[PDB]
Structure 1
Amino acid sequence: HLNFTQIKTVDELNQALVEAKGKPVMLDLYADWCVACKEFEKYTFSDPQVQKALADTVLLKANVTANDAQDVALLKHLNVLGLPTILFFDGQGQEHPQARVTGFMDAETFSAHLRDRQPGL
């Protein structure tokens, strides 16, 4: 498995970003009831090459299973309309919406995505 850092609230994301100054960041939105999210963990985040490509990236994950106030506020703040969703941030903590992943991608597809669209790297 890849080593993610759990963040819960909008401001935990913001702090995490401020701390990752100078480094590329990726945020995975996850939920227990999300099937394709599970596919990502089992088939994509598990790929040896995908992992090496993410070796020097700050990895963040928000677990939104409960769908509580904080989860909803976060999803709303990120303008996330569904799962799975992966966000990407540059060294200046700025997100690149044009780099979002909103469906499942297998290892190969995701590898090409990181190669062609990942910010800050």
Structure 2
Amino acid sequence: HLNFTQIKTVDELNQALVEAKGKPVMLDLYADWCVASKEFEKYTFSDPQVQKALADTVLLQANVTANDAQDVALLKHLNVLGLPTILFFDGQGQEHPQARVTGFMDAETFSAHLRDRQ
């Protein structure tokens, strides 16, 4: 069970971002009603390898299940179209948009993609 550190707002995100100065960060946008989002938790973030690859990565996670104002705000700010969507910021706080994962992805593929930051 990867241990994410929940965030709810755009500020909480930037806050967590400054904290993780120097480490690579991953943001996972999740929602209970989203099956794909559930499949991601059950079959990928659970995989040994995947967890190994994320060992030195700061784990952030926004649960947008309520789809409230704050939620919509955060999604709009990150230009997120739907879930599951996963973002990556280099250890210098820079997000790599072309690297985000949209939709379900199996552990083998995810782990690979994760280890391309070398």
Task: Please confirm whether the aligned pair reaches a TM-score higher than 0.5, indicating the same fold.
Answer: yes
Distance 1:14 1:5 in 2: 13
| Shift in Å, 1:117 | 5.0
Query: What corresponds to 2:55 in structure 1?
Result: 55
| Shift in Å, 1:116 | 2.3
SS in 2 for 1:117: coil
SS in 1 for 2:114: helix
TM-superposition CA deviations, 1:36-95 (whole Å, max 9, x none): 111111100011111011011000000000110000000000000110000000111111
Gaps of at least 5 residues in structure 1 are: none
Distance 1:48 1:92 in 2: 27
Gaps of at least 5 residues in structure 2 are: none
Are the counterparts in 2 of residues 29 and 62 from structure 1 also a CA contact under 8 Å?
A: yes
Identity rate of aligned residues, in percent?
A: 98
| Shift in Å, 1:115 | 1.7
How well do the aligned residues superpose, as a CA RMSD in angstroms? Answer: 1.0
Q: Indicate yes or no: 2:115 matched with 1:115.
A: yes
TM-score (norm 1): 0.94
Distance 2:64 2:103 in 1: 17
53 and 114 in structure 1: CA distance in 2 versus 1, 3 angstrom threshold? same
Distance 1:117 1:33 in 2: 31
Are the counterparts in 2 of residues 99 and 117 from structure 1 also a CA contact under 8 Å?
A: no
Distance 1:58 1:39 in 2: 22
Distance 2:91 2:52 in 1: 19
TM-score (norm 2): 0.97
